Amino acid sequence: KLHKEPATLIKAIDGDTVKLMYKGQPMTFRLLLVDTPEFNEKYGPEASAFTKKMHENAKKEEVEFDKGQRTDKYGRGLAYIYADGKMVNEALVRQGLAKVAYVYKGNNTHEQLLRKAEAQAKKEKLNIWS
Ligand SMILES: Cc1cn([C@H]2C[C@H](OP(=O)(O)O)[C@@H](COP(=O)(O)O)O2)c(=O)[nH]c1=O
Ligand SMILES: [Ca+2]
Incomplete structure (x- = not known):
């Protein structure tokens, strides 16, 4: 039900x-x-x-947009981002380098996937959970 669309890196910013x-x-x-x-x-x-x-x-x-808002109040695009097919959002959580956060109704298709990753990170006491 969501679709990946092309993009090219201009510049890494932060996490x-x-x-x-x-x-x-x-x-x-x-x-x-x-x-x-x-x-x-x-x-x-x-x-x-x-x-x-x-x-x-x-x-x-x-870039994979969810079903809701595609831009936030600062004009930032809101998406799931994939690097060679691997979701950056999920990878961050799975490594304990991000928390699941900012879960708004209707842009939350991957919520449960990410929460599963967070549980595994926390169990492994990784990084933020150390
Ligand atoms: C992730 C996300 C953030 N935002 C807004 C909420 C927060 O508002 P405030 O700036 O008023 O705190 C801010 C958090 O982004 P950052 O974590 O990049 O600061 O970005 C959304 O509106 N939708 C989103 O899906
Ligand atoms: Ca932040």
């Missing part, structure tokens, strides 16, 4: 935002359903590094 070219236009994307620590907070650097590596090493980046 939960990235600059991508989408339909030929530069956009800042904010990753749905997650919150990484800000760069100055604990695990912030590690979260940014993690996403910078995923995004930059990817051959193919893709």
Whole structure:
């Protein structure tokens, strides 16, 4: 029911935002359903590094919008972002580098997937959960 669409990296930003070219236009994307620590907070650097590596090493980046709001109040695109088929949002949670967060009704298709990842991260006492 959701669809992956093409994009190309313009620039890594931090754990939960990235600059991508989408339909030929530069956009800042904010990753749905997650919150990484800000760069100055604990695990912030590690979260940014993690996403910078995923995004930059990817051959193919893709954007998947949910069923709701596609842009937030700051004009950031709201999407699930995939790096060579692997969801960055979920990877962050699974590594304990983000919390599931900002779960608004109707842009929450992958909520349960991410919560499962968070439970596994917490069980493994990874990073934020250490
Ligand atoms: C993830 C997400 C954030 N936002 C807004 C809510 C928060 O508003 P406030 O700025 O007023 O706190 C902010 C959190 O983003 P950041 O975590 O990037 O700051 O982004 C949405 O509106 N929709 C979303 O899906
Ligand atoms: Ca954040």
